[PDB]
Design a protein around this ligand. Structure first.
Ligand SMILES: [Zn+2]
Lengths: 91, 135, 77, 52, 97, 30, 252
RNA sequence: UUUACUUAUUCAAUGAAGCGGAGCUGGAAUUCAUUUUCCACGUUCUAGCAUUCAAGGUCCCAUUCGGGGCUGAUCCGGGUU
RNA sequence: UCUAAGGGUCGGUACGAUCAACUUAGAACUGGUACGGACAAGGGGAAUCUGACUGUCUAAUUAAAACAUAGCAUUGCGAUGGUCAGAAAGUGAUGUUGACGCAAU
RNA sequence: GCUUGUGACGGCCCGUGAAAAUCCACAGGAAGGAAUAGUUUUCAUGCCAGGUCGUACUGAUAACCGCAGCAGGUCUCCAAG
RNA sequence: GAUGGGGAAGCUCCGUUUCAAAGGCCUGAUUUUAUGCAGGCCACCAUCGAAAGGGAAUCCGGUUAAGAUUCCGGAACCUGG
């Protein structure tokens, strides 16, 4: 049974801190507590500890990512343009 | 096809001999009461000969080139086959299933494998087999 | 603080040239499901530890005291 | 550990009392495969320039 | 593409899934072609290449991770390497792969 | 039984006998 | 009057940095013969968190070229860098994320971080979490590289200065509200004694120039000249503009 | 008012390790008598390994068990950069 | 004074036996209508002013609407620097720091 | 059941929650070595030695600090029905 | 908080691996005698700082007017040689 209507994970904060401040924390706390795919082993075992550090549960591969998401959208387009400039060296 | 035969050199990767090169002598492809798994009888190098130079003369050259062999039945999953080969009919008959089972014949078997490995280290035969694997 | 099971090696402990005292302890214990028997303990005082021999048969007890060397101070009980 | 004997602090293997017997197998396979590839790496290069 | 050729060998031929059984089939020389996922670890990937070189077995590199390699062979679990023993109606052994 | 599905031990045994009856009675018509 | 709060910070008695749990000074590898003529390979053994730092650290180990030993360096982890990945540092290293290259040997528009100001100082710019610089143009003769600093300022530095390819990990950290003083307490508990901050307008005239009066007001202009004296520089110092700007930012 | 300089002075780094100059080897490169010029010059699928004044090659000792040069590893200048 | 339900171990398409837990629910009967019997143990509601809240201070007359706070905003600074310390110094704090930072409001 | 130890886990962080002495193992193969006998004191047993300073009692409505044998203040462990 | 150094008329201040020529370690040669000299190593570079942190190793019974995991009896363990 669904217990809360809209607060979700931020129900621990009660009525404090305001609705809008609690709403933007909810978006980032869901991201920082969810699991992610491991690019190396293919398992849904990536979890966050010590923000900026993302450790696969098995597979022991530790990947440095964003504070609350495993891949920052700013870093995603940087990884593409660093990749794109690399083909201009050998070819 | 079948590349686990009496000629091929294999590397043991599990148990007291991991990282040591052996040669398969009698491959038992499938089935045995004492070993319900695919296995092979191998002869390997326990103590590799040491690096010898021309400065060493006539007393420790015979000492740095002392090879200590061993005979062992090894599972196929515990072997790492190579593309190299080693001539085996020199000591093919001295090692078999009966050299164990009253181990008193193992020491008789190891002496023949030892002196055969001494003379093939001589005259530059199979120099990769007598080189210790560094890991 | 160390138990000895074999009788033959226990005699070699008594002639170790460092032991000088030995005790014989008589205990009254019950059988597993029956009449009480005579359990004896032969204790050798070594330099570093104490070696004990628990003999549960009274017949073995009387002929093992005969095998004790006369150069050992045997303390009964 | 200084008081207890040798057999309680090691096992009869290469990297016995230092590794967990699975990383040993990984680093022997890796040692064999890289060095085998290393001599394949040079036999490719040996005539690559000679066949220009 | 490769995908529909992999669908024929599942229902018309005999195959093998997993790393341990692929090596067992490759030592016995019963395998004709092995297919390796893209996210397979290189140490394991390089060992399968060396094993196939000893047995003169062709190696095909699947353009996808093990999550979709199992989907190709019609399995809900992930398969890191697929071993082909005897092909059926497919022509994968005669195609460019 | 993880959610609730069974209020005690006796309710699970009764649901086992009834489900096994539903398993063999459909086998007779196949 | 009395010595005001910002003057006491220079004495360094209770205002020093809390450095017990820090993992060490995050610096690049020392510039040697290998880096300015070839490359050197390093292994990321573990990614660890640094106390008081928003960005994670990377412990990369290198082989000493002159002695048989292992040299463990402390790099700042970039996004995408993982444990066990080979890191190549030097002039001839490839253009991959995590590698350390001189800025003279990278193309225009390259995104780099942990950038040296002067060659050999082991990283001075683009160092906090989520920050980077952009390589805007080169200059072969009179060798200098023009970069775009995170603040938006344009700087000219030597082409021999090294830099790590990629963006510093831990970005988006300041996008989450702390929601309470307690979470802000633990944040400054590991950096220095600079929290909480009492307003100078609520103080006494001895404690702050803004203190005193029957109402809480500054009394005079809060824009303080650049040539002022210690004890007077309270508020906006050398401000060329005040108030809320109507419009946008990020000057082109 | 600009510009240049060896060093005075100032800043930084490194248990001051490879700087500067020339020469080899190859090639891009073009010859209008021959090189009038320019860059390269052992490591990038992989969480292995790399140390005993270095093995080899060649030359000496007084053969004996070993010891020493050149090369391997271009030369020149002592300005740590 | 009773009733019902909640378990364990040996033999499990003829399932009865046997040992071990205080938990809940229900029904009669009974009394000088008493029964959380001592002990223990929330007064509540309708509004206004004010500070968001937790927190903090005038030890020994003022605990508050005061301070702090999260949030919001402004300013300075790319190190040959910003802010500050020291009589001086081959001196120091921020700084084991580098703009998602530090410093000042 | 109470107290406590411990194990495998789970939650929390823009907080991920000491250092060193010290001990051990592994890699490495320097050196040292047997057959008419040499090599082991991380196997067992046997032998010797272990100094200096503190050690009583109170720890509080009477042994501490408060002018005191002051209803004040002062850290902690053990915890029956 | 010394030393090397740098300040300060000076009492003293800065600074702690710091712009320093900042040392002893395994020994092997010696059979004139004691520890000269022969190689190779290691560059950490004072010291102070916890009777609640780190840490080699003891228990039981008995005993005094007042002491004990310290004495006695029995049974152990560690370190050094
Ligand atoms: Zn993984």
């Amino acid at each position: 049974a669904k217990r809360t209507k809209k607060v979700g994970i931020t129900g621990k904060y009660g009525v404090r801190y305001g609705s809008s401040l609690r709403r933007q924390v909810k978006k980032l706390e869901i991201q920082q507590h969810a699991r992610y795919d491991c690019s190396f082993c293919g398992k849904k075992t990536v979890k966050r500890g010590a923000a900026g550090i993302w450790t696969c549960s098995c597979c022991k591969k530790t990947v440095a990512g964003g504070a609350y998401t495993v891949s920052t959208a700013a870093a995603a387009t940087v990884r593409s343009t660093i990749r794109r400039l690399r083909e201009m060296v050998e070819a | 096809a079948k590349f686990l035969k009496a000629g091929k050199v294999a590397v043991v990767v599990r148990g007291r001999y991991a990282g040591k090169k052996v040669v398969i002598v009698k491959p038992h492809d499938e089935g045995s009461k004492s070993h319900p798994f695919g296995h092979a009888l191998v002869a390997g190098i326990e103590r590799y000969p040491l690096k010898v130079t021309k400065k060493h003369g006539a007393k420790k050259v015979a000492k740095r080139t002392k090879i200590k062999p061993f005979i062992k039945v090894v599972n196929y999953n515990h072997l790492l086959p190579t593309r190299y080969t080693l001539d085996v009919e020199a000591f093919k008959s001295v090692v078999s299933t009966e050299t164990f089972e009253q181990p008193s014949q193992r020491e008789e078997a190891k002496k023949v494998v030892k002196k055969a490995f001494e003379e093939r280290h001589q005259a530059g035969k199979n120099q990769w087999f007598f080189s210790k694997l560094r890991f | 603080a160390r138990e000895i099971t074999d009788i033959k090696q226990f005699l070699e402990l008594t002639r170790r040239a460092d032991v000088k005292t030995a005790t014989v302890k008589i205990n009254k214990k019950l059988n597993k499901a029956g009449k009480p028997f005579r359990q004896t303990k032969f204790k050798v005082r070594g330099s570093s530890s104490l070696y004990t021999l628990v003999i549960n048969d009274a017949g073995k007890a009387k002929k093992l005291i005969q095998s004790l060397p006369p150069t050992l101070k045997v303390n009964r009980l | 550990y200084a008081t207890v004997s040798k057999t309680h602090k090691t096992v009869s293997r290469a990297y016995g009392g230092s590794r967990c017997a699975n990383c040993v197998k990984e680093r022997i396979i890796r040692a064999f495969l890289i060095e085998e590839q290393k001599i394949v790496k040079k036999v490719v290069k040996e005539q690559t320039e000679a066949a220009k | 593409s490769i995908n529909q050729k992999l669908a024929l060998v599942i229902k018309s031929g005999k195959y093998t899934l997993g790393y341990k059984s692929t090596v067992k089939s490759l030592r016995q020389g019963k395998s004709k072609l092995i297919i390796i996922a893209a996210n397979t670890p290189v140490l394991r990937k390089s060992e399968l290449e060396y094993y196939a070189m000893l047995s003169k077995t062709k190696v095909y590199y699947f353009q996808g991770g093990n999550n979709e390699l199992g989907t190709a062979v019609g399995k809900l679990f992930r398969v890191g390497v697929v071993s082909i023993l005897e092909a059926g109606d497919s022509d994968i052994l005669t195609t460019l792969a | 039984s993880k959610g609730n599905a069974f209020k005690h031990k006796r309710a699970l045994v009764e649901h086992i006998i009834q489900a096994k009856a539903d398993a063999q009675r459909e086998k007779a018509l196949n | 009057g009395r010595v005001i709060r910002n003057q006491r910070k220079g004495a360094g008695s209770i205002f020093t940095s809390h450095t017990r749990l820090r993992q060490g000074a995050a610096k690049l590898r020392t510039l040697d013969y290998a880096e300015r003529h070839g490359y050197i390979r390093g292994i990321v053994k573990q990614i660890v968190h640094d106390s008081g730092r928003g960005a994670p650290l990377a412990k990369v180990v290198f082989r000493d070229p002159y002695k048989y030993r292992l040299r463990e360096e402390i790099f700042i982890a970039n996004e995408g860098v993982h444990t066990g990945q080979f890191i190549y540092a030097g002039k001839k290293a490839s253009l991959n994320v995590g590698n350390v290259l001189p800025l003279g040997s990278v193309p225009e528009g390259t995104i780099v971080s942990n950038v040296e100001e002067k060659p050999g100082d082991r990283g001075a710019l683009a160092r906090a979490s989520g920050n980077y610089v952009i390589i805007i143009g080169h200059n072969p003769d009179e060798n200098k590289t023009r970069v775009r600093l995170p603040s938006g300022a344009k700087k000219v530095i030597s082409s021999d200065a090294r830099g790590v390819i990629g963006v510093i990990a831990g970005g988006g950290r300041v996008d989450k509200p702390l929601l309470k003083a307690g979470r802000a307490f633990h944040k400054y508990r590991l950096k220095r004694n600079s929290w909480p901050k009492t307003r100078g307008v609520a103080m006494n005239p001895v404690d702050h120039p803004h203190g005193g009066g029957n109402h809480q007001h500054i009394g005079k202009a809060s824009t303080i000249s650049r040539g002022a004296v210690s004890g007077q520089k309270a508020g906006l110092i050398a401000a060329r503009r005040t108030g809320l700007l109507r419009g946008s930012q990020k000057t082109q």
